[PDB]
Design a protein around this ligand. Structure first.
Ligand SMILES: Nc1ncnc2c1ncn2[C@@H]1O[C@H](COP(=O)(O)OP(=O)(O)NP(=O)(O)O)[C@@H](O)[C@H]1O
Length: 384
């Protein structure tokens, strides 16, 4: 059954819902549905040039073709609210132009409504109602995703923080081809980590070792983090032995108070102290302190699996100790539906750490995590 064809008409709201929930094959949610959602992500549902040119003439003027030697008319990749086209600028410099479908901001409300309608009619709500707080968060996240000026500023800012970095880099933004509805970056070499299980155990270890270090830095040293980390947005180049970072719609900057408490959670978990983990989780307001034991215990167990990695001097086998099955209880999805749901910052921090753990599980990496965590915890403590 092809529910897929209707969600493809609201692909942006569907995919953004999919990230928020973990339709991520996880061991609970109906595998009929996660199937459907995957089919949606890999559906290049494409749009006549006319529409793309509309966005281009509206935003760049009628001069814009004059900056380029070439503009490739077929997109080479779908983005959530638009398409990406290769171009070559007058001197020879290759770029990727990310162009929105016209009027994306403007149809957020209608598209979300229609999505809730498609899901309601196939009864997978399954509180039974329209979840008010989740509709509200999915609308905000979509407006944020639509803002390419904001995206351009987060990319420029990430690019500073990694200036000179021996392994990671951020393609430069091309301002003259950036605008509210178009985001243009330097083209990057290499392939996405999706296509990279075929690499060697040493390279895979090293990519993931670097990814998790970067994650600890994003949580505990930088003012800034990529949320919903995704192996499809890391481009590894064999020739240079570097990983490019794409997609700064994901970037957030949160109050230090959440991160200050999150460090204590992970410290306590590295130290195998379940009572500290729980108490700080309540103080952060992820937990209320009055959840049903069984669900509380499932979430505390998941946090302590991440603690095992950070407690051990042996290498941690992410591929069997850290699968979605092992750790999906980091985010019990029956929490967004309560009188006062968790501040969204909390969700992020767990999704950021959990997700980084998953990329390492996906790529079958194996390396020790203690020294990275003790280093990060020590420099955070020097900083006060
Ligand atoms: N500079 C670049 N070089 C090469 N490929 C690029 C570049 N920028 C974008 N792409 C490709 O286009 C895809 C989508 O761009 P992205 O900026 O990730 O859009 P999105 O709507 O946020 N989708 P997602 O990243 O999957 O959330 C990427 O995952 C790449 O496959």
């Amino acid at each position: 059954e092809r529910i897929v064809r209707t969600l493809c008409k609201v692909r942006g709201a569907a995919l953004k819902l999919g990230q928020m929930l973990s339709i991520q094959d996880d061991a609970f949610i109906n595998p009929h549905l996660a199937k459907i959602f995957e089919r949606v992500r890999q559906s290049a549902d494409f749009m006549p040039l006319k529409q793309m040119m509309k966005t281009l003439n509206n935003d760049l003027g009628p001069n814009w073709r004059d900056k380029l030697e070439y503009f490739e008319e077929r997109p080479f990749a779908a983005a959530s609210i638009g398409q990406v086209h290769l171009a070559r600028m007058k001197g020879g410099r290759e770029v990727a132009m990310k162009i929105q479908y016209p009027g994306v901001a403007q149809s957020i409300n209608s598209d979300v409504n229609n999505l809730m309608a498609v899901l309601n009619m196939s009864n997978m709500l399954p509180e039974g109602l329209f979840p008010e707080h989740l509709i509200d968060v999915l609308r905000r996240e979509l407006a944020l995703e639509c803002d390419y000026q904001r995206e351009a500023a987060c990319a420029r800012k990430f690019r500073d923080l990694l200036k000179g970095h021996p392994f990671f880099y951020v393609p430069e933004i091309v301002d003259e081809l950036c605008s509210p509805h178009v985001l243009t970056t330097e083209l990057v070499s290499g392939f996405p980590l999706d296509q990279a299980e075929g690499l060697s155990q040493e390279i895979r270890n090293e990519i993931c070792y670097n990814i998790l270090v970067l994650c600890l830095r994003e949580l505990f040293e930088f003012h800034f983090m990529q949320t919903d980390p995704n192996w499809s947005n890391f481009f590894y180049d064999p020739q240079q032995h570097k990983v490019a970072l794409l997609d700064f719609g994901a970037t957030r900057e949160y109050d230090r108070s959440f991160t200050d408490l999150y460090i204590q959670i992970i410290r306590a978990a590295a130290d195998r102290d379940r009572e500290t983990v729980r108490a700080k989780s309540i103080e952060m307001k992820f937990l209320t302190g009055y959840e049903v034991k069984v669900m509380e215990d499932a979430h505390l167990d998941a946090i302590l699996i991440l603690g095992e990695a950070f407690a051990s001097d042996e290498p941690f086998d992410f591929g069997t100790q850290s699968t979605t099955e092992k750790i999906h209880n980091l985010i019990p999805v029956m929490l967004r539906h309560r009188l006062v749901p968790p501040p969204e910052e909390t969700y992020s921090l767990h999704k950021k750490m959990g997700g980084s753990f998953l990329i390492c599980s996906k790529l079958k990496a194996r390396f020790p995590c203690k020294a990275m965590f003790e280093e990060a915890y020590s420099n955070y403590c020097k900083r006060q």
